[PDB]
């Protein structure tokens, strides 16, 4: 028998009125979305796996017979097991909701499963979910084009964001450059979407810098007072500041995102991930993968888990969709891989918490911590042999002479279990005032299992 390749062509039997298309492609993976009037044509393939090609149409093609709203067609070498499955699953996705925002929630949760546990099933499912979300939007938008014009930015930016994260989990450098091409950049931008738009189109950061700085500053002031902040607007502000912040902006930003990523906030991000990845997850409450990534995966708290992939995904997500590729690593290159938590200093230095003490460096071993889960605090400045422990001291003055002594200091709480609970930057005299009083974090409320440190732009003291 002569060795030959067997190639089949399948032609969709109606012409498609094409509205949008996008493709991301490298040797490892391919992902294409084609949108037409009442048409989705989607092709996804991972190297060494069978391609998946799916069509969703509002119309049913004439079938030869013996004498929901949409129709799903699957092209490929699926045996009955995967063929019956794929057809039923893809139809269940498209008919789940006529609301494009609920479809987008499901697309975010499916992309989250793919970043956390990369593999062919989660990659193909998340590619399908993104395509169906864009299709349901396109179908609603088709009807009233003037009313839909403000909602285009959210879908377009998420298509760029989700495709980038999915293509990297598949081993490719880039997601879609654009889906709804030329359309989104022409639409007026609402104030609530300014930071998202600056990220989506890679706009000159200069007119949005004060806005980004104020977003970060205010998010932090709220966090420390126990108030919720806009974590999505925070994500886009951080993205702008790490790409084109003035001197010391990137450093000030990462101190604040670290401070906002409390141990409690980190556990909330892990609980939210679990709830989003649940097979019984419902989209009555909207979900964005930015709700898990911001503040924690854009912070210098590295430790929490079965979701270390989140940090790397968020650092990738931070690059605009219009030197080190990682803007977090770019802002503070001195921070090592073994750092549980870092607090950036002036002069290319940072405080660094680790389990094991550094070699040839000044370090403090922290008192009152379990021997199996220890805490070493070191300063990483670009050889010391001495065994250091932090000096026990009380807080003087307590006088308010319009001079801030504890300004630029970090108040740190740690447990006997060896977890850094809180990391409070004292940025104002107002905060310094609350530190002496009896906000919430620095006044006493918790028992004799929690210790506290004052970290200076020099050395370390144990309070009280």
């Amino acid at each position, epitope marked *: 028998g002569v060795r030959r390749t067997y190639t089949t062509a399948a032609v969709w039997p109606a012409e498609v009125a094409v509205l949008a298309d996008a493709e991301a492609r490298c040797p490892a993976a391919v992902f294409n979305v084609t949108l037409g009037e009442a048409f989705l044509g989607l092709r996804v393939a991972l190297r060494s796996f069978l391609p998946l090609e799916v069509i969703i149409s509002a119309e049913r093609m004439r079938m030869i017979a013996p004498p929901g709203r949409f129709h799903v067609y699957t092209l490929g070498f699926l045996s009955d097991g995967a063929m019956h499955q794929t057809m039923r699953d893809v139809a269940a996705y498209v008919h789940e909701s006529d609301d494009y925002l609920a479809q987008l929630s499901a697309a975010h949760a499916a992309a989250l499963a793919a970043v956390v546990q990369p593999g062919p099933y989660y990659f193909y499912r998340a590619a399908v979910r993104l395509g169906v979300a864009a299709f349901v939007f396109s179908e609603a938008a088709r009807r009233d084009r003037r009313a839909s014009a403000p909602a285009l930015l959210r879908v377009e930016s998420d298509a760029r964001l989700l495709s980038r994260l999915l293509m990297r989990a598949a081993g490719c450098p880039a997601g879609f450059a654009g889906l709804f091409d030329g359309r989104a950049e022409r639409v*007026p931008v609402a104030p609530a979407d300014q930071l998202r738009a600056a990220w989506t189109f890679g706009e000159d950061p200069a007119p949005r810098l004060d806005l980004a700085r104020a977003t970060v500053a205010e998010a932090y002031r709220r966090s420390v007072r126990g108030k919720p902040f806009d974590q999505q607007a925070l994500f886009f502000a951080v993205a702008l500041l790490l790409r084109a912040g003035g001197p010391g902006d990137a450093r000030e930003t990462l101190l604040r995102t670290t401070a906002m990523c409390t141990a409690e906030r980190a556990a909330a991000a892990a609980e939210l991930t679990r709830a989003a990845l649940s097979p019984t997850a419902a989209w009555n409450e909207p979900f964005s993968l930015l709700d898990v990534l911001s503040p924690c995966a854009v912070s210098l708290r590295r430790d929490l888990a079965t979701l270390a992939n989140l940090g790397a995904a968020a650092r990738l997500a931070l690059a605009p969709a219009g030197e080190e590729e990682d803007p977090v690593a770019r802002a503070a290159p001195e921070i090592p891989a073994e750092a549980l938590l870092a607090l950036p200093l002036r002069g290319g230095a940072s405080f660094v918490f680790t389990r094991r003490r550094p070699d040839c460096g000044p370090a403090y071993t922290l008192g009152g911590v379990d021997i199996a889960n220890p805490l070493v605090l070191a300063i990483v400045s670009n050889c010391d042999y001495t065994d250091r422990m932090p000096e026990s001291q009380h807080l003087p003055a307590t006088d308010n002479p319009s001079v801030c002594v504890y300004c630029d200091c970090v108040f740190v709480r740690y447990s006997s279990a060896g977890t850094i609970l809180e990391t409070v930057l004292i940025e104002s005299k107002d905060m310094e005032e609350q530190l002496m009083a009896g906000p919430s974090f620095n006044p006493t409320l918790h028992g004799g299992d929690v210790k506290a440190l004052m970290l200076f732009p020099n050395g370390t003291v144990v309070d009280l």
Partner: antibody
Amino acid sequence: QVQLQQPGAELVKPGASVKMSCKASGYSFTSYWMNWVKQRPGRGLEWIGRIDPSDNETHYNQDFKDKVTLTVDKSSSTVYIQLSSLTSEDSAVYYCGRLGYVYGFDYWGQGTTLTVSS
Amino acid sequence: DIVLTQSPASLALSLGQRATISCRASKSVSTSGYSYMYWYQQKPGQPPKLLIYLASNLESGVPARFSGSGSGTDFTLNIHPVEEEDAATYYCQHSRELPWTFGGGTKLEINR
């Protein structure tokens, strides 16, 4: 889209109280302060106060402290302003305005026209 | 209380010309590198619309003919070139300290 929804009108008798509402949608309700602003026919703007819907923290203009109470209903995403002992001096358009993180008023309701009249 | 004084109370200009509106604060509204100064446009039957935040930053969707400048006590709104849709009242506003206040307004009218 961010929307602040206010009823168009309130007709109230002198000496009575009024509660005006501002229903917020299209953003995280508890992440932003809500302001109230008074405008009398053909006159300027007066800032009344602001409320944080997350914890009910208020800041008031001292001129309005005895006249005005701000409250929220988190479950309906609604901010209320209550005015007591109404006079014709209180007849005005009352705007709700969301505080942006830059500390300007970035989104506004259409305003409630309050008429104090028998 | 910080009092904001606008000048002029009214401005009449031809299309294509420069509108300059001043706001003077009784005390400084600048602290820690920021000026807590805002400009709004209002047309009859409409709420005010934010044009400029933190003295000098153009709000999203505001045409580039609008600009703001100043620090401390003295602030300016510029409109150049003025267009027909610029006929409106303009207010300055501060968020420096309690109470937050607005200027008295400047009505801009077009000569044609």
